[PDB]
Amino acid sequence: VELTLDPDTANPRLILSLDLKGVRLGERAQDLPNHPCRFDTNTRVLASCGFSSGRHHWEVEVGSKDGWAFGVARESVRRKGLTPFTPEEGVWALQLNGGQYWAVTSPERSPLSCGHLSRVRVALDLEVGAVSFYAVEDMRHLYTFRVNFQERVFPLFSVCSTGTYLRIWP
Amino acid sequence: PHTVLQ
């Protein structure tokens, strides 16, 4: 059973693919019910499956243009109002912005000298407490956040500009 | 600026 994006969490401006694998940002807000689990301001969506224990892999195909960030979020990530996109808010992610790849550390993001990215493998380890990112062509390490996760952790996707996308690949 | 909603 492979991951799919959870439409009930998705910001109403996001457009999810029919197969629930891909996400881009739309030009209008869909008329969707506001549900406590739905991100109402930040351009985020979670997968429908979260993890409380064990080790897990998934892969994310990434657009070549700016606008995306992806990784994992603690389930308690704030859904309502404009919120920071930071580890303190329970978001551990890579981001493409200004033509540069970043690990979204705080208060300053960390630039990654990894070269062009096409698909990224995410390795989540809830037994030791880490989430790691690898570029699939050679499995070169991109970044590892070491976190003592204290709750369920969900795959996280965010697209805040048109002209880029993220897609779960399995 | 363009990423405030990320």
Let me know: does A45 contact A9? Beta carbons within 8 Å. yes
CA contacts within 13 A on the Cβ side of A100: 9
Separation between Cα atoms, residue A65 and residue A96, nearest integer Å: 7
Nearest CB to A95: which of B4, B5, B6?
B6
The answer to the question of residue A1 being in a domain is: no
The answer to the question of residue A52 being in a domain is: yes
DSSP A44-79: EEEBS--BSSSEEEEEEEE-SSS-EEEEEEETT---
Domain residues for the domain of A120 are 7-169
Separation between Cα atoms, residue A83 and residue B5, nearest integer Å: 8
Q: Is the peptide bond before A107 cis (omega within 30 degrees of 0)?
A: yes
Separation between Cα atoms, residue A133 and residue A98, nearest integer Å: 20
Task: With CB atoms and an 8 Å threshold, state whether A66 touches B2.
Answer: yes
Nearest to A135 by CA among A116, A110, A154: A116
The answer to the question of residue A151 being in a domain is: yes
The answer to the question of residue A55 being in a domain is: yes
Starting at the edge strand found earlier in the chain, the sheet holding A44-46 runs: A44-46, A153-159, A68-74, A91-97, A100-103, A110-112
Separation between Cα atoms, residue A132 and residue A67, nearest integer Å: 21
The answer to the question of residue A110 being in a domain is: yes
The answer to the question of residue A35 being in a domain is: yes
**Resolution of this structure in Å:** 1.4
The answer to the question of residue A2 being in a domain is: no
Please indicate the experimental technique that yielded this structure: X-ray
Task: With CB atoms and an 8 Å threshold, state whether B2 touches A82.
Answer: no
The answer to the question of residue A87 being in a domain is: yes
Count of domains forming chain A: 1
What torsion do the CA atoms of A126, A143, A102, A8 make, to the nearest 10 degrees? -20
Which residues of chain A form beta strands (DSSP E)?
Answer: 14-16, 22-25, 44-46, 55-62, 68-74, 91-97, 100-103, 110-112, 119-125, 130-135, 140-146, 153-159, 166-169
- Find the CATH number of the domain harbouring A118: 2.60.120.920
Which residues of B are less than 8 Å from A97 in CB distance?
A: 2-3
